[PDB]
Write an enzyme that holds these catalytic residues in place. Structure first.
Site: not given
Lengths: 231, 231
Positions: B103-105, B123, B152
């Site tokens: 998720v994310c970074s 990212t 995601g």
């Protein structure tokens, strides 16, 4: 500091549905100058319904006057509804809080504390019949607002209303900035988040699985209501 | 027990963006027979970027072979990208995991571990330029899938892809049941979750506020890429 710190407080109790709380926590904790509290009878480890361990940061007694109080839900709510210390703290804080809020079955705790009387409110869909006995006007909406009371039915409703709170405490531009910075952009791959959208077979399963819990929670609710009636 | 337990594992690291992890955690922890791990160099308290304290349940060494591994994001990802122990554990687990996710970074950690080479991936939007140096084909979608890799972009993307994972590990009816039981029904009061939908003034603010972080993360990324190149 040299800005006004908004005091934001989540009730953290054993068998909490953790995401109820941790959702709005991450959103609100992003806001300028805020201080966020996880509140229990004592600071220290509290186990959520999943076994996930959270840490309460303050006792009831040490909690500062809150600007926002939020009660999450979860299995643990049934005990909380008959917890005289917890209910007294929730009433104390609700008297002066700018915003009184809950997620999921958290609204039934507000109800047991006498704070839903004559208010429009919602709760987790499987337990919605428990609103009227606690004096609420039951409303089937994702987030129901009545003055400074916000109640959210589902697990992430606090993420959404946290954005509304952000916009009012600060401004719309601030709320939009937080949403962008966090990149909060939900898009579920199923449409079964409501009993009116999920397949009937699925709705019946879930009703069957919640039956014993609802039975137990109704008994608790009726005791909580009778306490309020005796007034 | 007398069913197959799916082993689901989240990397839990200092300065994690907690909601990245706690979202999918509550969803996946709802599934039949599953066992969910919060994985760090040692079990015990880990502080998230908000100051929220989580508990790691297992060390790298004691973590069982995972069926799902998930790397969340947060400020803490920069350190993790040059953490030789953490990267080696992520590679070890990714070799055989049914599902490798972030998720994310968190995807930049996968990238630093050499796991995005030639893969479509996303990212967090502010850091999207850091994908190509790690060998990924950068894709601007909320959840990007490439074989058994799911990445995601945004903070709750793991809640959404957790439902996809539920449906594949078990069945669509199971995923729909979890969504209904949790009542996961998102409806944000703003539309600023994407740089293509938020107001331009807001997008520029956020770009300005992420500038120093992006600068630092780019330097880290380029070092991580050079390590992979030397191969």
């Amino acid at each position: 500091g040299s800005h006004m710190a908004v005091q934001i407080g989540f009730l953290l109790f054993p068998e909490v549905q953790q995401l109820d709380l941790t959702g709005p926590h991450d959103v609100l904790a992003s806001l300028p100058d805020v201080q966020v509290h996880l509140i229990w009878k004592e600071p220290g480890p509290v186990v959520a319904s999943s076994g996930l361990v959270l840490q309460a940061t303050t006792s009831f007694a040490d909690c500062p006057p809150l600007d926002v109080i939020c009660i999450p839900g979860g299995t643990g709510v049934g005990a909380l509804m008959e917890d005289p210390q917890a209910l007294a703290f929730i009433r104390q804080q609700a008297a002066r809080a700018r915003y009184v809020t809950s997620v999921c079955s958290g609204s039934l705790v507000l109800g047991a504390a006498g704070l839903l009387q004559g208010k429009r409110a919602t709760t987790h869909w499987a337990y919605h019949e428990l609103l009227a006995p606690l004096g609420a006007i039951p409303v089937h909406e994702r987030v129901v607002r009545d003055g400074n009371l916000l109640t959210g039915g589902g697990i992430t409703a606090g993420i959404d209303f946290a954005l509304t709170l952000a916009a009012e405490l600060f401004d719309a531009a601030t709320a939009q900035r937080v949403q962008l910075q966090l990149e909060y952009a939900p898009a579920p791959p199923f449409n079964a988040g409501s009993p009116d959208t999920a397949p009937a077979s699925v709705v019946q399963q879930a009703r069957q699985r919640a039956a014993d819990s609802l039975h137990k929670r109704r008994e608790i609710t009726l005791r909580a209501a009778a306490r309020l009636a005796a007034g």
